[PDB]
Design a binder for this molecule. Structure first.
Ligand SMILES: Cc1cccc(-c2cc(=O)c3c(O)cc(O)cc3o2)c1
Ligand SMILES: Cc1cccc(-c2cc(=O)c3c(O)cc(O)cc3o2)c1
Lengths: 809, 809
């Protein structure tokens, strides 16, 4: 149909159809008369998978022959989403499959909707892992994603009475055709036990064994015939485990619980044992596998053959574990083992928010990982000796820099461990990386300035343009060709089309189509009625105080109060859509969801309002909902308090997809505004510097309440039950927090936000100029490709060269 | 190679090879350089499965068009064993696959050994279910095996220090290529709750829901192109289950425990809740499915379209459940629902031993199945009203016949429920069925004589001859053709070959080859050295007091003591092999294993003994070990106390396979001796009548001890630590039981056993006459085909006609 979806040749289509029918019959054991849409999805899934297999085998073969340096991306989270469409895109099969399925009388788009998201992540961090794998495959790096195959991913979000309810995400119920179990590569992971000191070193004994069984999922590069591997570990009990009889068998579930469920916290540390077990499990199994591969190519060459990237501190135990293997098992001396470790490991920091930093109680590590604790103490001692020597007499520095925190309970600072044991530490946006050096890691920076880097985040333009927004991909392809899909910087060529009437018309047409398609999706799947001519004002992301969905709420109520004051005045109509999951134990986040829906209950049913203002809570925000709503958005809401959002990646998704951004100078927003020009961005609010100024003198919210009548009105409405008639005080916690303990200074940004929002409405009234500004955004979005990011990691951290050369078919 | 294994045509072989390589590549994602024997097994498994699929789809299609009466075999146990070889046999693919694999340079027999047994059964009962499915498919009945897909089957048995250790049978670890999950046919099963009485009937409310997900396994008939289904249910939690968050997800394991593990008790009732849950689970899901099918063809026709066979009382709740559906959900009146139920259901009794009879406490049923209990009470009342009217004034009868037992705790007699709610009740051998009518069900018989039938057990000659003993199958085929494989009565034609020198030579040659092959298997897999010229004296079966492995032990020690008395006298050399699992909680059974191995420790290391007497405990007796050891046996030990072994099926396996039988007039032994002639059978010991005589006067073991010096010697040796030097009193429980509380009268049969064993040795010294008697056994074994059995069930219970007509390919 459209060009970027590849060729639908007569041979190709005939082949796909016959393989489809082969799978329906032999794989699914169905015939045409009993097959459900789900059977059909499966037959197609198996058919597309068949095209991966040759390339997968060849690619892994190739890495064996060539023996390049191997990159190991360790993450507790891989937020993959659906695999089918992505596979077709990267293999150029999309049109062929559309055609083939069409001829069997099936709608491919309908079958695509049947696939479960692999929701093995919370948000930004998990999705970054997923874009990375895609980019690493596209850039022909010998790269492996290593994580945990959780039985249950991020919970499914239901709204009941405007409240979030959680349901188990049973994503494996119907099978996963993408994975391949590899029982033959099963490895033991050890827990508990005790340390025995002998003549020939320390020994870890009387451990409990859990087995780690790997599942391999193919990761196809973009049209380069490279297929990398994501290896996820499953926990399995050994067969002598507990071995009255019945209970012993039933108690196997204790061991296997390790890989049962993803912890649903976003930028929040919960110090639970099961979480530490997950962290050790993935690290122990991965390291063994890494070392097995290495030995099948002394340890001096390890760092020339291995890079290990730590995605946050979640896999920080990789550092003590590598030491443990090198010292205790391989019999290297400390100093050599340590050199190998530092040169192997690199650490990506994802946030500066203190609630997110992993500080594990010592008593937990003492029981669970007694040897790792000893190794940690040893690292700490030697590290602090370096500090002492560099900064003699600075006792305070020693305290601040220690891996071990004194206090109520002793804790290990996992971030301190990561910096000590890594040759590179990066933040995820320029401003975030600067903050790391100015603030939380100032001390570490002064010791080892060479370690601290920036690697600004990116997104894959495969999933995030071609896949989710084929209409926009095509009109771009029409002008500048297809080369940009794997070289996003080429989008700059679009700047010469900013005064082109045809292009302006096309850009606006795709947006309108996306909006119609999304408005219809709302009706079908959730029985809700939105005006497609309204401005689509979208804030989608995890529900957090720092991300200030509440600021958006205040704007929404303001628009509402303004309409009621002057019903007969013109306002640019808006659909305000807010979506995201709250962590199940995060009371305040659960309250914000309730407020959002409660505002909707009032606003959407007011006859005076008309279709001038709608408030929609988008249920079950996940990767596949993002693919739908982001192409449909006009305004991207990126309104975190300056200094809190380390980077963000949503912001990039919307830039790429023809939305304008309203946002603070926070995270990658800064680099985005710099790329597009400040005049093509709706920047408001305090800068980092202003927030600091407010902190020194003290944040008094009352001041804002006293001076801004519009704001006082909102707060009175909240307090008095305007938005909760049956429970007048439902929102007392919200009001109380805003007035007395707002860490995120919602009121401070209120005035500048509302004014800046007026400027958005003003520009929306002028379609041609709106669209021209959109063009200037899309055209400068190239920096925010994960290909750029990965190329930077490869050159400046991993010490490998990216490649765009095809492997042979 | 050999004829009964089918044709290896050039097209066939070429096809198999290319499909093998297709699977290796696409299914297994391996190439030739990385494939393990296990990969190869899998590729072949997938290749053979492909040949089933067409026939499976066609067969189920056919049952839809023709709409015949459907047989539902409900069992908690299906002891399937391996599927690969069986599939090849029934599809005539065995030679083709041998050839194809040979040309790829693989040994098919080596790959066959990689397959896990589906050990979803304990012993006789479970294996009977498996032979039945085979026969039902061979006789073209529209039949469905319904059970539970246990994650863990019968435990793997290790011997450590001569003691049984249990290990989890993780049979699904590497995948099961035979099953097909059918998530779309998932059904809710309800538990707990309470009963509400309304205007329009009783209602079962506030229940916990567990989901039952079915897995279908194909059951191929012998060369008739019929493929039936075994549907096994897996327990799955609903997604709102428990739904702080983490624990809720982890607690899903409570619900799913239902299908986790097979209870490893053989002829023993354990009144545990989890077992009752398993029993309800399989019944609830099966009935719903049965009814769904029926409605897609009023309830008057149900019994013309449905037969439900209850394999023991394990699925007895089918009766109250059917009532519950008909009365509470479908709104039939009691009497009509009851008529439908009785005409639908039939009950097979498997034992008369009281320890085996299911007597569920009322308090358990009250909590778990409150409605079923009410229905049970209602059945009881109406049943006892019939009894009262037929036997006025016989208050005692009423007590004896009640479904509800009075006492310490009230219990439901599940057997009483089965008789009341079934139109047919059968035993499993003539003598067993007679005992049912004379003793435990005398009262029920007098009320409804028409209900009581015999259906003597059988075994499938597919698995139990062709598959495990191809050499014997062939020499038979050479003389009389192949027709006997699906018509075992034709073995009678062999009687005219009893004086044929060539046949005698061939029969003896196959036995010798089987023995050599098995002796070698012992060396390879278990590093043990046996003389292949010895008589192979084999007792393989679950370890039980009633089966009197101890009697065998007494014989073994006798032979030993006789050798030591007269070292320089000739004795026919014997390898005595004893194998079987003990239930994990069955202390006495665990002691017998220890005694067996302890005898081995003494006997096998005595230089005076030479290779004249060896004692081997065969570890991990299971279906696939039976396939190996049974073809290799000379003497089948069937030595249960008369009246205890309801039938036995091992006895039949050995008859078919060229062993002579030493046994009591117990179970099917009686019919076997009747078929072959008593003079071709080594019958010894008390009859049923003699045991009764001993019971009236009282069993004094001391008497036997006082009168039989040979026996006194053994008992003194046991007592004084001859067989346990380091723990002199290890076997005090054994001695004490034999002397004071032997329910099975081991000493009573001792003298007659030892003498009869001498007659076996005498005949073994004369190979020609041994072999002639063997011929007379094989030739009369035809009655013991499960095809005869199933044909009898079909005609006299289910009301359907068997068929040997092929379905079209
Ligand atoms: C970064 C930040 C700033 C403020 C608050 C939070 C946060 C996130 C959570 O997921 C959370 C939780 O699950 C339970 C809880 O009791 C408190 C929590 O607080 C995180
Ligand atoms: C038929 C029969 C006659 C005598 C004994 C048994 C028998 C079988 C068992 O599996 C068993 C057990 O698992 C635990 C136990 O405490 C006692 C048991 O007794 C069965």
């Amino acid at each position: 149909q459209i060009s970027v979806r590849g060729l639908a040749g007569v041979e190709n289509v005939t082949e796909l159809k016959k393989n489809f029918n082969r799978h329906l019959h032999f794989t699914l054991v169905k015939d045409r008369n009993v097959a459900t849409p789900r059977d059909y999805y499966f037959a197609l899934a198996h058919t597309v998978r068949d095209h991966l297999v040759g390339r997968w085998i060849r690619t892994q073969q190739h890495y064996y022959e060539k023996d390049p340096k191997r990159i190991y991306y360790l993450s507790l989270e891989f937020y993959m989403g659906r695999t089918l469409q992505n596979t077709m895109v990267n293999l150029a099969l999309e049109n062929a499959c559309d055609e083939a399925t069409y001829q069997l009388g099936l709608d491919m788009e309908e079958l695509e909707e049947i696939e479960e998201d692999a929701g093995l992540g919370n948000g930004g961090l998990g999705r970054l892992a997923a874009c990375f794998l895609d980019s690493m495959a596209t850039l022909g790096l010998a790269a492996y994603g290593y994580g945990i195959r959780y039985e249950f991913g991020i919970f499914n979000q239901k709204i009941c009475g405007g409240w979030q309810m959680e349901e188990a995400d049973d994503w494996l119920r119907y099978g996963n055709p993408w994975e391949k179990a590899r029982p033959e590569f099963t490895l033991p992971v050890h827990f508990y036990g005790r340390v025995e000191h002998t003549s020939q070193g320390a020994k870890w004994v009387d451990t409990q064994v859990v087995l780690a069984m790997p599942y391999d999922t193919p990761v196809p590069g973009y049209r380069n015939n490279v297929v990398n591997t994501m290896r996820l570990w499953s926990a399995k009990a050994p067969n002598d485990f507990n071995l009255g009889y019945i209970q012993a068998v039933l108690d196997r579930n204790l061991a296997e619980n390790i890989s049962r469920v993803l912890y649903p916290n976003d930028n929040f540390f919960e110090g639970k044992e099961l979480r530490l077990k997950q962290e050790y499990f993935v690290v122990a199994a991965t390291l063994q596998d890494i070392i097995r591969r290495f030995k099948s190519s002394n340890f001096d060459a390890f760092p020339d053959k291995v890079a290990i990237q730590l995605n946050d501190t979640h896999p920080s135990l990789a550092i003590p574990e590598l030491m443990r293997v090198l010292v205790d098992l391989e019999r290297l001396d400390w100093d050599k083992a340590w050199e190998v470790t530092v040169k192997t490991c690199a650490y990506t920091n994802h946030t500066v928010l203190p609630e997110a930093l992993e500080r594990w109680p010592v008593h937990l590590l003492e029981t669970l990982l007694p040897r790792h604790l000893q190794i940690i103490y040893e690292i700490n001692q030697r590290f602090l000796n370096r500090v002492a020597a560099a900064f003699p007499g600075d006792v305070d520095r020693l305290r601040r820099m220690s891996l071990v925190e004194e206090g109520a309970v002793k804790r290990i600072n996992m971030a301190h461990l990561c910096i000590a044991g890594s040759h590179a530490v990066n933040g995820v946006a320029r401003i975030h990386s600067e903050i790391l050096k100015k603030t939380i890691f100032k001390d570490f920076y002064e010791l080892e300035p060479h370690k601290f880097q920036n690697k600004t985040n990116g997104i894959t333009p495969r999933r995030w343009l071609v896949l989710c927004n084929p209409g926009l991909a095509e009109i771009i392809a029409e002008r500048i060709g297809e080369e940009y899909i794997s070289d996003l910087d080429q989008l700059r060529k679009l700047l010469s089309y900013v005064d082109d009437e045809a292009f302006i018309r096309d850009v606006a047409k795709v947006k309108q189509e996306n909006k119609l398609k999304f408005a219809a999706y709302l009706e079908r799947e959730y029985k809700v009625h939105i005006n497609p001519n309204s401005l689509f004002d979208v804030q989608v992301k995890r529900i957090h105080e720092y991300k200030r969905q509440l600021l958006n709420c205040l704007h929404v109520i303001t628009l509402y109060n303004r309409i009621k004051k002057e019903p007969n005045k013109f306002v640019v109509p808006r659909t305000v859509m807010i979506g995201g999951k709250a962590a199940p134990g995060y009371h305040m986040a659960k309250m914000i969801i309730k407020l959002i829906t409660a505002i909707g209950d009032v606003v959407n049913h007011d006859p005076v309002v008309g279709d001038r203002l709608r408030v929609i809570f988008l249920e079950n925000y996940r990767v596949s909902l993002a693919e739908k709503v982001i192409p449909a958005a006009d305004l991207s809401e990126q309104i975190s308090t300056a200094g809190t959002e380390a980077s963000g990646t949503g912001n990039m998704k919307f830039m790429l997809n023809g939305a304008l951004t309203i946002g603070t100078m926070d995270g990658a927003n800064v680099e985005m505004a710099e790329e597009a020009g400040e005049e093509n961005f709706f920047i408001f609010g305090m800068r980092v510097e202003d927030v600091d100024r407010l902190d020194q003198r003290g944040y008094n919210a009352q001041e804002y309440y006293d001076r801004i009548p519009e704001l006082r009105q909102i707060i009175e409405q909240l307090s008095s039950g305007f938005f909760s008639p049956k429970q007048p005080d439902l929102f007392k916690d919200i009001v109380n927090m805003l007035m007395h303990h707002d860490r995120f200074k919602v009121f401070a940004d209120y005035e500048e936000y509302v004014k800046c929002q007026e400027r958005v409405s003003a520009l929306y009234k002028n379609p041609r100029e709106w669209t021209r500004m959109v063009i200037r955004n899309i055209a400068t979005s190239g920096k925010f490709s994960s290909d750029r990011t990965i190329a930077q990691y490869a050159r400046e951290i991993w010490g490998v060269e990216p490649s765009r050369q095809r492997l042979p078919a």
